[PDB]
Design a protein around this motif. Structure first.
Motif, PDB file in Angstrom:
ATOM      1  N   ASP C   1       0.820  -1.232  -0.071  1.00 54.49           N
ATOM      2  CA  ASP C   1      -0.104  -0.195   0.050  1.00 54.49           C
ATOM      3  C   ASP C   1       0.994   1.290   0.010  1.00 54.49           C
ATOM      4  O   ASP C   1       0.615   2.266  -0.388  1.00 54.49           O
ATOM      5  CB  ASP C   1      -0.945  -0.038   1.291  1.00 54.49           C
ATOM      6  CG  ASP C   1      -2.115   1.077   1.006  1.00 54.49           C
ATOM      7  OD1 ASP C   1      -2.945   0.923   0.319  1.00 54.49           O
ATOM      8  OD2 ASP C   1      -2.111   2.002   1.959  1.00 54.49           O
ATOM      9  N   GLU C   2       1.982   1.184   0.642  1.00 57.00           N
ATOM     10  CA  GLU C   2       3.079   2.153   0.803  1.00 57.00           C
ATOM     11  C   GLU C   2       3.629   2.745  -0.773  1.00 57.00           C
ATOM     12  O   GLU C   2       3.906   3.872  -0.573  1.00 57.00           O
ATOM     13  CB  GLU C   2       3.976   1.970   1.769  1.00 57.00           C
ATOM     14  CG  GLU C   2       4.740   0.855   1.513  1.00 57.00           C
ATOM     15  CD  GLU C   2       5.710   0.313   2.540  1.00 57.00           C
ATOM     16  OE1 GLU C   2       5.907   1.020   3.468  1.00 57.00           O
ATOM     17  OE2 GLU C   2       6.039  -0.663   2.342  1.00 57.00           O
ATOM     18  N   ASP C   3       3.557   1.864  -1.723  1.00 60.05           N
ATOM     19  CA  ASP C   3       3.953   2.194  -2.829  1.00 60.05           C
ATOM     20  C   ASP C   3       3.067   3.117  -3.720  1.00 60.05           C
ATOM     21  O   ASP C   3       3.372   3.660  -4.656  1.00 60.05           O
ATOM     22  CB  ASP C   3       4.215   0.913  -3.670  1.00 60.05           C
ATOM     23  CG  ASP C   3       5.567   0.025  -3.011  1.00 60.05           C
ATOM     24  OD1 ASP C   3       6.246   0.679  -2.339  1.00 60.05           O
ATOM     25  OD2 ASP C   3       5.508  -0.946  -3.528  1.00 60.05           O
ATOM     26  N   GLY C   4       1.820   2.998  -3.014  1.00 59.65           N
ATOM     27  CA  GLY C   4       0.866   3.948  -3.623  1.00 59.65           C
ATOM     28  C   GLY C   4       0.404   3.986  -5.211  1.00 59.65           C
ATOM     29  O   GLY C   4      -0.132   4.821  -5.882  1.00 59.65           O
ATOM     30  N   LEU C   5       0.539   2.852  -5.868  1.00 55.65           N
ATOM     31  CA  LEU C   5       0.187   2.794  -7.141  1.00 55.65           C
ATOM     32  C   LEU C   5      -1.298   2.427  -7.378  1.00 55.65           C
ATOM     33  O   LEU C   5      -2.121   1.730  -7.021  1.00 55.65           O
ATOM     34  CB  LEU C   5       1.237   1.504  -7.826  1.00 55.65           C
ATOM     35  CG  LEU C   5       2.619   1.717  -7.451  1.00 55.65           C
ATOM     36  CD1 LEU C   5       3.171   0.345  -8.070  1.00 55.65           C
ATOM     37  CD2 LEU C   5       3.086   2.884  -8.532  1.00 55.65           C
ATOM     38  N   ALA C  73      -1.997   3.639  -1.416  1.00 54.02           N
ATOM     39  CA  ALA C  73      -2.798   3.290  -2.534  1.00 54.02           C
ATOM     40  C   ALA C  73      -4.185   3.375  -2.088  1.00 54.02           C
ATOM     41  O   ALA C  73      -5.065   3.583  -3.007  1.00 54.02           O
ATOM     42  CB  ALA C  73      -2.467   1.954  -2.925  1.00 54.02           C
ATOM     43  N   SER C  74      -4.688   2.686  -1.070  1.00 54.76           N
ATOM     44  CA  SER C  74      -5.945   2.632  -0.550  1.00 54.76           C
ATOM     45  C   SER C  74      -6.647   4.112  -0.365  1.00 54.76           C
ATOM     46  O   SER C  74      -7.759   4.479  -0.765  1.00 54.76           O
ATOM     47  CB  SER C  74      -6.256   1.713   0.779  1.00 54.76           C
ATOM     48  OG  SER C  74      -5.826   0.613   0.642  1.00 54.76           O
ATOM     49  N   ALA C  75      -5.764   4.973   0.297  1.00 52.37           N
ATOM     50  CA  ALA C  75      -6.205   6.346   0.441  1.00 52.37           C
ATOM     51  C   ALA C  75      -6.587   7.176  -0.829  1.00 52.37           C
ATOM     52  O   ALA C  75      -7.455   7.718  -1.101  1.00 52.37           O
ATOM     53  CB  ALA C  75      -5.084   7.194   1.131  1.00 52.37           C
ATOM     54  N   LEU C  76      -5.626   6.946  -1.997  1.00 52.47           N
ATOM     55  CA  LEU C  76      -5.634   7.624  -3.346  1.00 52.47           C
ATOM     56  C   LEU C  76      -6.856   6.930  -4.135  1.00 52.47           C
ATOM     57  O   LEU C  76      -7.793   7.759  -4.630  1.00 52.47           O
ATOM     58  CB  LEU C  76      -4.421   7.410  -4.030  1.00 52.47           C
ATOM     59  CG  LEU C  76      -4.335   8.228  -5.222  1.00 52.47           C
ATOM     60  CD1 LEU C  76      -4.470   9.698  -4.900  1.00 52.47           C
ATOM     61  CD2 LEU C  76      -2.832   7.878  -5.818  1.00 52.47           C
TER      62      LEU C  76
END
Lengths: 49, 116, 116
Positions: C1-5, C73-76
């Motif tokens: 998730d930290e990778d934000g893809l 990623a979840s937030a985005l």
């Protein structure tokens, strides 16, 4: 090698942080969610931080 | 932040602060520019030591449409910490100031990146 | 998730996406509010069909202390699926989106209990 030691000593006794030799870090408590702030400033090595 | 409260420490006895509160409030109004669109209010006065008194204030600002609201605490603190304003405050006996708003991490990071 | 893809499918040919990538990236930045604390990055671009292109992005957010990190990623994804934002995305040619994070059972249960 004389004018190097002198400059290094002048560098040691100084707040400019060229290997200040008085480098110690103290931990200030800060509640969340303010951890994301701070955030060093002018002459902070991310290494030391 | 919307409550706009700024705590000020004065190097004056409580009786002296209360005894001349009208004058103190107007001097703070003058430091702010003295316009009739700003009004300094005293939220509280508390003794802290023999010659130390805390005075909590807020400032009400009026808009051109007659609406009123409190100046945000961060905004008011930012004004009072400006070097020229701080010096004027010190001339009134102010030796410190504090806002109650707990800044976010991003706000704190911004202040550290741009301390001026 | 930290990778934000986040993977986005566009109803546009790959050559069109690449040909106007500067503009596409800025439009995504605008959808996010356009602040200078957010930066859209393109991780990859891949053709999927004659008039379908997948564009993988992430968003770097900067804190007030100058620190940077990727938006999770979840937030985005949560932002982009909001009805108003989804509609804006569709106006750019986006016809679908996906995050890579495999949600936990408790997360999935929460989403089902509160689908809005």
């Amino acid at each position: 090698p004389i004018p190097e030691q002198i400059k290094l000593i002048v560098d040691k006794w100084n707040p400019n942080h060229p290997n200040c030799a008085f480098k110690t870090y103290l931990y200030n408590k800060v509640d969340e969610h303010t951890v994301p702030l701070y955030g060093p400033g002018p002459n902070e090595d991310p290494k030391e931080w | 932040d919307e409550d706009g409260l700024i705590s000020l420490i004065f190097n004056k006895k409580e009786s002296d602060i209360r005894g001349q509160q009208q004058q103190l409030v107007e001097s703070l109004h003058k430091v702010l520019g003295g316009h009739q669109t700003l009004t300094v209010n005293v939220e509280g006065v508390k003794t802290k030591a023999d010659n130390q008194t805390e005075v909590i204030i807020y400032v009400v600002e009026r808009s051109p449409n007659g609406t009123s609201r409190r100046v945000g605490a961060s905004a008011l603190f930012s004004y009072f910490e400006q070097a020229h304003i701080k010096a004027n405050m010190q001339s009134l006996g102010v030796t410190g100031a504090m806002a109650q708003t707990e800044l976010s991490p991003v706000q704190i990071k911004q202040l550290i990146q741009n301390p001026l």
